[model samples]
Target chain A: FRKMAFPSGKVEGCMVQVTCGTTTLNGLWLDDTVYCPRHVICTAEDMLNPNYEDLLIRKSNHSFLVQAGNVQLRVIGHSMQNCLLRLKVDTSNPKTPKYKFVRIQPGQTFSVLACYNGSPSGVYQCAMRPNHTIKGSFLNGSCGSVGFNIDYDCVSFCYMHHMELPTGVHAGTDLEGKFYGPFVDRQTAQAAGTDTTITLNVLAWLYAAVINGDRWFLNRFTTTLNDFNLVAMKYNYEPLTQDHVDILGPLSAQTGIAVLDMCAALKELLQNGMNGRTILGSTILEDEFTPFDVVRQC
Target chain B: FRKMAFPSGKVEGCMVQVTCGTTTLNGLWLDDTVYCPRHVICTAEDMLNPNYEDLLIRKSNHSFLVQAGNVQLRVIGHSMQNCLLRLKVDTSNPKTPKYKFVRIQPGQTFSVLACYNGSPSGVYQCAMRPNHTIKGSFLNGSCGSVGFNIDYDCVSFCYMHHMELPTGVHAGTDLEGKFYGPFVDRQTAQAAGTDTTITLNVLAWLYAAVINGDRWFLNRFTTTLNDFNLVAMKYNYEPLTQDHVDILGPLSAQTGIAVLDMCAALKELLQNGMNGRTILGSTILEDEFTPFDVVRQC
Candidate 1:
């Protein structure tokens, strides 16, 4: 209930256990027994904010949001020490309880990615300690001495916000755990040399680069095509081949409309997001009316 | 062997067994037995064309074609009777043999979608049946009396042709059962009001409709989003939100480009196919510069 400095000398008869709901902690000290049920006792070295109690009165910005598939919570530590965050999901569902604990460095943004299965709402409590680090099987930090700290509680409801765009210099994986981006930058750069207007040839190159940039896309598209070719030779299945290079060639590129028109039609779709299958179709039919008309007519 | 009229009497003592490639079938008739070892003995009532055998010379159009996914082969029948299509995925792997037998009526094009998991190559054999339908555990049809039919044998390898654009009126599931499609036609029709344009609003509607149309797409998207949100709320997570309509509103739907240009850029991709995850990002950020610029520059 009160903030206390680190014990100056050896102290005995400290609070060793605390109870919350049906859960109990047997290895806790008096300074560690905060009102917050999910508090953790941490030593000075392990604490992300050693002077957390005094600093809590100052400006502190706490924000929690989702980034693609990851749920991230930003905890601004006024002091330079690591802290423990205890997260729970589906607070309403006692039968099937879900919990996750993580260590957050001072001024760091911590996320519960692996364990959180994306339930809609939950409650969380944050508590800090000085000398002894609260170390347990589920604890995300190391064991140490006790430290002075404060406890805080918060609740959140799960909902989508925005899709962080895949931004990079080359066609690559997102440093953040977001969706993969095609050869957007590279393709955009290559097309910069030509007219601002997109063309069938440009689209062909874009498709080629997309496949080259994203391995998953290429594998799915190529494997499907190879399977088709295996059986199609006999039945006179006379259609365009799955040859990536040929499909991107000028002669094979046979779209009835200008490429820029097709690109314009898909502005919204690309902005929101698209997948391998849809991209594969567009790449294969770079020179066709289908992609253009399909989106255009939409 | 020559074609004949549908036999009037019972086919007693007729050869009712046949074999091919270590596979043997029993209970066939002599008249049904031909050069094709997969033939089955049939009754007159189930015969699509009783003079089918004699009419083999009468320009019977038999052809197989493959679509994009997994080298799907479509068998074209010119009659109205149900034909059993016996398809196998891995003929070489007998230890774990996979089979699918479906009832495809005449003039109907039946496709082999599942067993062919898009491997580079695989073999398949199709055999027709008479009164003695190929009733077995792997059969996709229910046990019942024979309908009009033609017993034929043809084998084909997996191959590719074109991605059939999802064509339908109402939001309905695909007959072949891959997934579902929204009223692409209706959306397209609405877009017709403008000078052949696809707006951010239309893209938003498209994404919403896609989810509504395809249960698979909705389940995957919602499940993933729900999982992310579940953990996010614990940390007081708050983001933009899933307000598709608001995002689609005029105040937000500002892409400084022609709609047709967007469509043209995505020509090749639509020609192939795409999934929801990929499309989600695009629709979510329709007004943003990245999605449009990425493809526009290309």
Candidate 2:
């Protein structure tokens, strides 16, 4: 009875999906689309108990080898919810991290957030080189458990790098087909600072700016959000290459966010990518946590 | 600052969508292609404060009149998150709750849970009259916050009377657009019952059952899950009505859940409504709280 980390592609029948009928007896794991071997016992019981250990280790860096022969593979090391899970033959692994994870495949679409117990607040950002498990995660710069977290356990949720977005200077209505938003400025700066709209009105314009590639407005507003101490100026930055689009076209479209989801919206901030454009995750919209009454960090 | 509930029209320029240039003024709210009256002041400031009272009162059926004076609308009354909000010369509503909400509005969308402190659990179920807000909210049969909760505040998240899905007898892959399922049985009753794959494996098959309308599988499985202590005997249920289809076609398609969305997938469980078939929200599935290591309440 423990929270065992999942065995990555190594286990023979570890990640099988069954698509056969019966109380039992005859069926095939779609992974290989083959029938069960001699005896297919209920191995899931391993993590089904109340005593299963979810070794949620925290901030530290070290590694050790799992002794040979049938060793249980941990979904990750350093079980904490905010560390980068680097399995470098070895391995490793919170934040503006109340991001939700939604994985939609055909009809079985689902979503989740991760445990946000230890993430201390401050400006947080990071991104992973695309490795193909998921698209992106939302980090609202708060702490507590979110559905699919940013730990190795959640590598299955997101394989790409995700620079988190915190509660900023504006929030959006999130209506119509304008997922990125047409935009609205919060009353904070406009009305002497007491009012709180989401903190990204200008960024909203900037998102729209990037969508339309409005050079004049993009630079102007990017400089505007600069004073808020929220966005990253350098982006450590990179450009989206033609190869990136060719790859994203199939992969992103396969997951369905290729055009109209948050990824597509965020892509616009870096739309042409090489047009000397840059982008970051936006913290401009209304989330369920606070509705429209957002508290601005800028 | 007060947490104002939104008005349901009648206000001349309340809910508007802007699609034009901005700095000071140059846009139409798109509600009527109209301009602001003199000026649309920063009314959002009303909800942007710590003083906003989320009047979360306890259970006891009661109602009140908002003393009028341009009565700033509140999204709903009993500012609590588990009540059915109705405003017809009267109105109402907590829970086996903690559902996250995801709003994919173009690129500018978002999600959230609810103010979930007071909801005490037992078997909880509900459905809305459907007037526009959102789809179903997941009530994990627990208490605590969930994004896009089942409350008037979250009515914007789901308007259909969502027969809540609790930690059920099984969970699905939520993949391959099998948003319903191909299916798999949990290890619970199979292995002397210390395992939990999710509470609804049989129900998963049942979901698939309705999808294909397999009479043999559907009735047999339905009887099997009947002993779970969870779920209701009668849905007091009704048919999806040809009228319902006609209506759901345009509306559901607009919201995008038409074919593979939960609503569409759910439709199959009740597919061919008059085939003398019936269903209730399935309580079988793996949810975030317990993951695959679920604790069976049955």
Candidate 3:
């Protein structure tokens, strides 16, 4: 059996160190929906801010936390201009450390990424049980359909202090399978303009369209998309088109009980068209794209 | 303290199932670096395909695993077309489970995202200690500097089975704090042309420049980015310029780094011109932009 660290159930803290640019600030923690109090403060025994741009418990610090609260990294700074805030912990080696985003150095560490596009006015509880009993990210996506504008929904990037494990990243990329938009499709598209918006709401394109590109089936259109909305979202006022609209047509359009899948769409666009047609408009360039393909497939 | 999940020192398996765009594949596992063997395969005591497109052990399947090998999912489809394959698991609840990418319904689940751009050969080991000991994706990023083209490096998405925790997502996003690229920068840019590439390797612009953009200072430039590489990478035949080049001049150029933190960079750009000159090439729209801020600043 694997040994579990932190015999102390839920670890909590009140004092933390913060760093922005070259300036550093310490003595700040959480009380659920609040910050900075020059007056009254948390009474958790020890007081220190060693983690600086991070939320972690280091050996140099475990020697510290043995008497203080769980010092964590809060992604917030004085000026919102050109500065970034984060709850980074170092897990490169846990020694069985208690934290996340601790850089072992050169591009590797534990961190969190959350996005909430819905209303952010509710007091929602966002926590997780990675592998051990631990409180997840204190900053959570306010209850909504997706987490960030980039995320499909709730993404709590949590870590099990005991083994340096990571959790909850499946939130944005594939939205845990709800989206199938490719990363390259997203990259190349953004590279051109850098201000365009790409939303992967194609389910409607596949499930709702009761007709194909044939003008005849056009009669059964509604939110199914005008012109099939077939050319869904636009780029520079240009409608993005999918040549496999026929294959994506409602099951009824094909033969009644046939739901269109990724294979069906790609096959129709490739084979039947030896025959030519559009699929992801964003080409795969022979399949080096990412997660999006893993998504939208089902 | 949370009790460890797996009592076994280690868990091994063979015999798995797969699915892609409605197609199902069974009978396949691994030998460290190989694939299928329809003829007399792994001699594990289980044979099942209940997970479908997932790599999980459900209540129905836990009963199944009691007599089978840890059934997993391989994200490889027949013809990488519209189809996407994955190793998804359902951890909405794990009464104690063993796997990843388990959806709790809407937009939640455990999944893996690996990117290896350096190479794709040579048997390399990719494992983890996710809380309780556990094995990670057999797929590795060949010996290299980072994971996927989108990753910084070494992202092993693993699970401990007893709890539904997620790990290794810091792979490409802020990349565990190594990247400060804003999600919005990525989206808006792609939205324009859908073929653009937004690389967040802005370190050279900050760290290596011996001088700034004074023309005379520009002489000190080498790979430090011509013109201070002020506009670093271009967009559409145009050099994406950072109007704050003077503010961004080598810290030594500005009295020794005075090293130019996020705040300094933004402050100079804003304050010097009553605040004008550019920063981000991609405007932040006054906050709302993400992680990029968390990164680059550090």
Candidate 4:
């Protein structure tokens, strides 16, 4: 058997870091509904400017964790423009890291008892395995018979599959797969334009239709984004197409399945909450100045 | 419409520059087939070296009509390693630049006669259109299928469309659409692994059969890889159990449509040769990675 660097018995390591936020406070309320990174401060009439020290394990120094709590410890920062405090997790080990983002109302004193679990350690770096594990991205589309083969099983770039591999690049060119259609019968691919552009047009054409007609599909779509990216809330715009209707046909007219497995991969990518901060930029952030590079097959 | 940039037809003003590459003298019979970047030499018999000159048309050297009669100006470079030379066609008027990679051999010299509609200004940054243009990395399956969907088109992430996308990401994350894949009953999926792992396992299991058995029914498969990742190219080798065969009946047994899609995508991706460089990479080069991004639907 091949030695798994990341074994079946998950090996996990967590990191705890501290940062400085703008203003100090007297009290804050802990709301569990919102997801982290997408969190906000919910203020009340009586509660304004909560004391952060009361919530810390090191009540004296306001730095570490004194006890363990149901929710993992995450220090909330300031607003977007000023950028006060920040928290991050090194959960790249795949042994699932669980944490929550809470919206705190001002003037509500944070209780250490409410925040941490009853542990002696002032600070903590922790990870543990759970009974069940769910992996890979799976989405079932119930579009009106029309579909695309969205190969969104995972990040489809094999060369970029691991940051630990070599640059698996070859010459850049375009690709042409079978075409179904806006035209259906006489629809043919054009010769001009970059390869990435072609990939987007097809994905957009169908997805727009899904959002327009199916409310259940859209709600599921939004809900998926909410859970997957750990967002507080998500909503997509209602589809409107005069030009779109003509080109793509009415929802009823839009029949037949065009499986865009590759395109679905792109969709799952867009719904995430990460704000394009990583190596090699975002998965689909491209413009005229930058040309797209396709992952090389191994 | 809009000020047509460099290489665009019928521009208002013509402020342009072009460049080419030429190899120096290395006996006439055998032209220099390749170049060594580290050693900086041509791969030819008894050829000490090849001289190379960057084709530049400076203000002082505005020699538009330079003719090479007996004295030949050779095509200097070859596609090797990280070595690449781009011949850019630029204009000072509208301020736009277009480029082409120059690849030529010894004993051949490109000369420019007339400014408009003339011979190539040597391979580097020549003004000719590409001979072939592929519209996409899309393919259709032949039969009984484990149908799927593509959230994003094959143009996003790194180039290949058969494999998983890069790691440390979740759905609705970086891309714009959704992708799904192979299903052998939810029970089969559970036995295989987690959500995505099972999808990939399905691809792997099918690809193994297609390659070894010469099974025609397993007609197509598609997967993509990033430029830095390389999976073991070896196909599946486990002997199929009679029990396993029994679970899937005659047509079901023969039909590996979804699996074929995965295989075809992987095979073609291995052939990606951009600028004479193979997309294949060794493990060591993975830390510093690049991916194939942006694919439009055809």
Candidate 5:
């Protein structure tokens, strides 16, 4: 289990996939409560290399890419405020790393997408910071005004690649699971007022279900996505609703409901979602506007 | 709210009650997490001198006995290894302070039971500590061999009072809520194995219900005691089986489920129970027991 490295000092969130010749695993990595990196994509830890990777990743810095099993991992650090990300494929030859930097200007939210093979099959957002001590940016000498640090102030534009993986039951837009914050600029800060306000409403509504043990959103979501029974039994029947779609839109796109265990998936959205500190800047989007009271099965 | 004072610098657990004329309210105090003291015997916090007393008591130093409401509060510092207790009720006049100290013998677990007006109805546990720096201990020339300070190395026998309140649906033996420990002598420590073991099992069972949202014990309890349906609906279903009763009898007696909201009672047993740092000898119980496989509904 070699440590997986990121160009940025810290990664906020990411959707990762490791593919051997035939077997491919889909998973998520987040840095909250505990930073879970290289957590296995499956239940039993015995399916791959040293085993036990499938367990809820223990608290540790090391992340692994199961090279022995012919595994090739593709990771996208999603919706982060200030993070620099690099995805490297360690084949028998020298390592080739792809870099992306995401930054929000005063008025607008933007991310630098990175790519591989000079093609468009892969792209993901990277939130970048300024370069302090490092002289240059980008391993390949790509962008200018190069920022070297993660979550620092820097200007560099790179390609954002959109890679294909196992399609989940309900998938959202490409910008899924990314958080836009620390406005650093003014225009977006004004926009943030609207976002935070929306977030508070959404959180209050979500928290109601938790306290009441009601599953309105989760139920409606599965039915709309055609994964009707996906998480119904786990939460006693629930899914996201119409206004949720109108607002949050196809969040399943990034969440891979098909591969994720229903229990873990629902728990993440409900338990971890509520307990998380930065509620406004999370998978629960702020840009989307959903009616508070009118939407739900309950 | 006057701060409740204890002979020990801190109190780990205590059984307390407030009386207004003939009506009395029973409650508990724990010194962990938020240090909930006098969480309240009633939901309204009324019917007493202080109105806001109904709120889950937050942590603090002071505990008050209200004479305006003709209230007399009784508190027992229990199951503590290093601390002692003394409860003084301020009367209309200056003070007729009652003093008591509890100590253990070489080979047995025992406490000194105190009384008011030589009557059984008016009593509470007061485990006074040693006057560490001094050679002996005592309060106002009462009780012989007064040991001073909490968890000190001296021995002093004091009073253990038995008070009455709502006979909750499940009364787990009269000694339910009382804690027995701090055997200064070496021989009795071996016997303490039984006390610690029982505590461990009870804690594990309580946590199981919490994690799984089961309510077996609480259900059967209220039912048997004619408080049926007390907490039945709160949890998904029934209560403890024969095996549970065989081990932890009348455990509900101290819990006062008859008077408490089922959720609060269970949460106390679970949340407050788990959150409590000092399990065996203080600082949370971790080295004992794996997940019990045989217990639960979910």
Candidate 6:
């Protein structure tokens, strides 16, 4: 048999044809040889409008660490799902795909929301997996079953600093292959308004919106709830940079706690109205002993 | 082999003996057998509530719906992870156990809350299982895992319809023997508080109370906010019941919107504040928007 050795220099494991012994089958074969191919996958979005892109990066990490404009990471997807997605990292290990699992539908389009630390600047790759099971060999057939991803930004990358990549980096699907790419980077848009508070009334309105399509109340509620707040409170604001990806110098800047605290507080308040009652029980809506509902700094 | 047939003369499929191969220890034998002889399993709590004796009967059919009061379910450890739990309407098939899987470390305490419809009445039964594989069989003397009980309740026994009673209900942990038989006839609670108007300020206070864990704030906020026009102006005010077990509810019910929404809004508001701009945001917080902030009553 013509064979390829893994980056670890061990001969690739034997190709086990997926067989449903005593279980049941319809003549389907989950073979490794049929799947192995090459490709690049990345989080792509409209870079022309920098504000939206900048906002996402700002929310995800605060540092000059990642460029806000037209950002992209080269990766390869072997498989994906609704609740999970996996991909490979860039480097010599690119062939040895480092995988990260995301909770998204396999056929549904999704963007990678990386939780990378301000790092030592090693190139990282990720993997996407769906939330279902596949009948295939463990080592070569499918790694996406458990939502596993490579960790260039995690502690695991250190374990394989000096290794060759795996062959999973080359596989492609009909969509990812024929229609989308032989070599085009995958693009995504930030899910607008997901950042807003999730509340009962919002849920109710969302339920209404989803069911009724465009109820006036739900449409107005969604639009207003989705808009960003503009306040005139004074505070020093410092942005994040590339050097701040890690915990130390290479760290990502985060939203100030005071600001976040205020945000969380307000989100709960709105949710109380949205749901019409205190649903979580321990929220501010239940505060019963204070006489301070108003604050006048004048 | 004294195999206990299910109500339908079949064994439960979900239950597997914890064994090496031939030697099998029955599941029910683990606990109740250890205690039933001397009845040491009866804790002080049980003495006060003597395992709910009697053939319970509902005076009214609607008395069985869940409204408020304690509801409990049992889960048998099957060692399965991340699987949806299901309950069967039929008990005849003894081989299939009801299932509700929860994720916890080897030793952990988790709770789920349930809201009552407020028509209180009835006793319900639930069975649970984990779906993990074992190397040993019950015949080989392998011990089965521990089991736990889950409780819930409805609000009132007035409006809701009564539930169908199970013929045999047991509380014992033995696989061969059932627990101290069925919890009898009971009523259900009426459904209430479906559609009502909620206000933004009141919503704020609700969240502040729960997430903050500041009872002082909760008490104060609940009292003050409860009377807000948006809330008061809305029709329908339903009282809460004592049998509420909270597992899943709205985020605002747990935390205030300040923590949820205001943080982002405050960040923006603070920016304007720093620029010497008028602190004019249609929110209860400094710069955060209230649910009704933009939807002034026409």
Candidate 1 lDDT, tens digit per residue, A1-298? 0011111111111112222223233211222111111222223242333344443334233321111123232332222222222222211221211212223211111111101122111111111111111111112111111211112111111111111122211111111212122212111232111111122322343333342232232221122433443433332322223342243344224434233332332332233334425443233222211122222111
User: What stretches of model 2 exceed 4 Å from their correct place?
Assistant: A1-207, A212-214, A217-241, A246-298, B1-91, B94-298
TM-score (all chains, Cα) for each model: 0.19, 0.18, 0.20, 0.18, 0.16, 0.20
Off by over 4 Å in 1: A1-298, B1-81, B85-298
* The candidate that achieves the highest lDDT relative to the unseen native structure: 5
TM-score of chain A of 2: 0.18
Candidate 2 reaches a DockQ of 0.02
Which residue segments of model 6 deviate by more than 4 Å?
Answer: A1-298, B1-184, B187-298
Ten-residue region with minimum lDDT total, candidate 3 chain A: A1-10
Would you give me the overall lDDT of model 4? 0.19
lDDT of 5 at A56: 22
- Model 2 Cα displacement at A42 (Å)? 23
RMSD values for the candidates in order, in angstroms, are 25.8, 28.9, 25.6, 25.5, 29.3, 23.9
lDDT by residue for model 2 (B93-129), tens? 1011122223321111112221111211111111111
Encode model 2's per-residue lDDT on A69-177: one tens digit a residue.
2232222232212221222212111011122333322111111221111211111111111211111222321111111112322322221111222222212111110
- Give the lDDT of residue A60 in candidate 5: 26
lDDT of each: 0.22, 0.21, 0.22, 0.19, 0.25, 0.20
Write the residue-wise lDDT of candidate 5 on A11-30 in tens digits. 11132343323333332222
**Tens-digit lDDT string for candidate 1 (B57-126):** 2422322221223223222332212221122211121111121223331111111211111211101111
CAPRI quality band, candidate 5: incorrect
Give the fraction of true interface contacts kept by model 2: 0.00
